[PDB]
Amino acid sequence: DLELKKERRVILDCERDKVNDIVDQVITIGKHVKGYHYIIANLGFTDGD
Amino acid sequence: DLELKKERRVILDCERDKVNDIVDQVITIGKHVKGYHYIIANLGFTDGD
């Protein structure tokens, strides 16, 4: 549904677990390729994978 | 180096372990997105992940 609206910019506001889950789902669906930008809205960046 | 020559078609002739390793590396580098074609050159297709 996000691709249906051509959303190349996504802001994730979650903890270290939901961020990891969403990242794994992005990798599975193949959206971590060049052309997208993510912002991890939390004080811990290097905490996740 | 393969992308330097614009190689969208790849034929993997390996066992069930090297195929899994190459698939994991493809997923990490982000090349399983639409626009590529792979041929697993072995008698076992559903054996791997």
Question: DSSP letter string over B4-29?
Answer: GGT--EEEE---HHHHHHHHHHHHHH
Q: Could you tell me the two tokens for B43?
A: 């008698």
Tell me how crowded residue B19 is: count the other CB atoms within 10 A of its CB.
Answer: 21
Q: Could you tell me the two tokens for A45?
A: 């960046």
Question: Which residues of chain B make contact with A3, given a CB cutoff of 8 A?
Answer: none
Tell me how crowded residue A19 is: count the other CB atoms within 10 A of its CB.
Answer: 21
Kindly compute the dihedral angle of the four CA atoms of residues B7, B11, B14, B16, in this order, to the nearest 10 degrees: 100
**Cα-atom radius of gyration of chain B, to the nearest Å?**
11
Rounded Cα gap, residues B6 and B1, in angstroms: 9
The reply to whether A29 touches chain B by the CB within 8 Å rule is no
The reply to whether A33 touches chain B by the CB within 8 Å rule is yes
Q: Could you tell me the two tokens for B30?
A: 């982000």
Specify the experimental method: cryo-EM
